[PDB]
Amino acid sequence: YNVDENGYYGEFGGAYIPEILHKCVEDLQNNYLKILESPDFQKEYDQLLRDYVGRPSPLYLAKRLSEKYGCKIYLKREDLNHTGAHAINNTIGQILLARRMGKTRIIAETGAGQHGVATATVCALMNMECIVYMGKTDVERQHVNVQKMEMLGATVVPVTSGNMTLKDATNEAIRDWCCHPSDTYYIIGSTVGPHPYPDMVARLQSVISKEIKKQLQEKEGRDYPDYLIACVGGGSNAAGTIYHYIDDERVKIVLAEAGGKGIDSGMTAATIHLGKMGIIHGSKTLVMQNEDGQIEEPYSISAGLDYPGIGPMHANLAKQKRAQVLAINDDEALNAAFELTRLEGIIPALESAHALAALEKVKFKPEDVVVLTLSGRGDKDMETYLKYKK
């Protein structure tokens, strides 16, 4: 269920792009693995993960949370990463690749602002020009992260097309990318876009499941859990979380996508529940489509889940029934965020709370071992959490 030699996961994936990018995408294909696997990349990569990011991220037995659901739940604490989310695993990896390929101008899209902060973070470290596209809606709702990016010296470009969300910021980044093939590297923020971006970002996040294996070995005497649970906007934290377990049928995979106001409300981002075959941002995958077959304007309270497409990996997983996918609504997420706060003293990202909310919908046995990926911390969503509390 991992990628094939042509960029495909079953029938989903590939690279579907105008000729203007054919050259630089082709360079990226058939160099990215050479670079990822070189001893130089892997040393500097691993050194920055350890000293800069603070990997490995803990695997934490959440005791009161385990008592509520009548089983053993561990949280993979990506929320403790430098910059507060899993995104930084990806930006560190991609910036090292970008430099190996001689690129000098860095762009990215962001919804939650975690990928934007993680991109401005590594660009300041490296002293490289940073431009971050962000939907206007998102710059309002995730303003703490816009501030961080501006202090880090990045240029934040509000995007005013569509409903001004991730798909739109991505559209703008892609337009930027098209005008600047020579000098610009595009740090895509999820397991989305043209091959090799899905597999690349999956590889860079795989460190998550590499650690889980070792940490479960220490704690449980076996290297596999009964369940992996992760939210999914485009697929990147889930991918990392499942990479080294993707084919291992002892491990059940539960993914939580954003149901918004409910999958039938006309306001949602439940791509698996609602999507049809399309091309989105250079990938042939499942995507929400409106009544004239346009890519649909999605909704979610969560900026990082609010994307109408899904990575081709998860399109495939879902289609094959290797992974079960749940639509989780705004309210369910909000309540699960308040849940982890009072139970474990951890304020989660609204994104990650979609994953937490899924614990209500699964029939656990007492001997079950669950690993849920806490993809980030909720500092960004405090205004929203406190509004909800009133």
Ligand X SMILES: Cc1ncc(COP(=O)(O)O)c(/C=N/[C@H](Cc2c[nH]c3ccccc23)C(=O)O)c1O
List the single partner that 344 binds among a second copy, ligand X, none, CB under 5 to 8 Å by kind: a second copy
- Contacting residue, 4, 140, 150, 183, with a second copy by CB under 8 A: 150
Pick 161 or 341: Cβ nearer a second copy: 341
Residues 327-366 that bind a second copy (CB under 8 A): 338, 341-347
Is residue 124 a contact residue for a second copy (CB under 8 A)?
yes
Rounded Cα distance, 116 and 139, in Å: 11
**Are the beta carbons of 309 and 275 closer than 8 angstroms?**
yes
Least distance (Å) from a second copy to the CB of residue 38? 20
Least distance (Å) from a second copy to the CB of residue 341? 6
Rounded Cα distance, 250 and 319, in Å: 19
Residues 57-86 as x/- pattern, contact with ligand X by CB under 6 A: ----------------------------x-
- Contacting residue, 22, 43, 50, 214, with a second copy by CB under 8 A: 50
Rounded Cα distance, 69 and 62, in Å: 11
Pick 172 or 339: Cβ nearer a second copy: 339
Residues 245-304 that bind ligand X (CB under 6 A): 304
Rounded Cα distance, 95 and 89, in Å: 10
List the single partner that 351 binds among ligand X, a second copy, none, CB under 5 to 8 Å by kind: ligand X
Pick 146 or 238: Cβ nearer ligand X: 238
Q: Provide the residue type at 195 as one letter.
A: H
Rounded Cα distance, 143 and 123, in Å: 20
Rounded Cα distance, 208 and 119, in Å: 19
Pick 49 or 256: Cβ nearer a second copy: 49
Quick one: tokens of 17?
A: 């792009």
Work out the burial of residue 144: count CB atoms within 10 Å of its CB; fewer than 13 is exposed, 13-18 middle, 19 or more buried.
middle
Is residue 68 a contact residue for a second copy (CB under 8 A)?
no
List the single partner that 233 binds among ligand X, a second copy, none, CB under 5 to 8 Å by kind: ligand X
Crossing angle for the helix pair 114-125 and 143-151, to the nearest 10 degrees: 10
Interface region with ligand X, contact rule CB under 6 A, candidates 94-102, 103-111, 206-214, 262-270: 103-111
**Are the beta carbons of 281 and 296 closer than 8 angstroms?**
no
Pick 35 or 62: Cβ nearer a second copy: 62
Rounded Cα distance, 116 and 286, in Å: 25
Is residue 57 a contact residue for a second copy (CB under 8 A)?
yes
Beta-carbon contacts of 288 under 8 Å, excluding residues fewer than 6 positions away, are 268, 269, 271, 274, 275, 295, 296, 298, 308, 309
What residues make contact with a second copy under the rule CB under 8 A? 50-54, 57-61, 64, 77, 80-82, 120-125, 127, 144, 147-148, 150-153, 338, 341-347, 379, 382-383, 385-386, 389
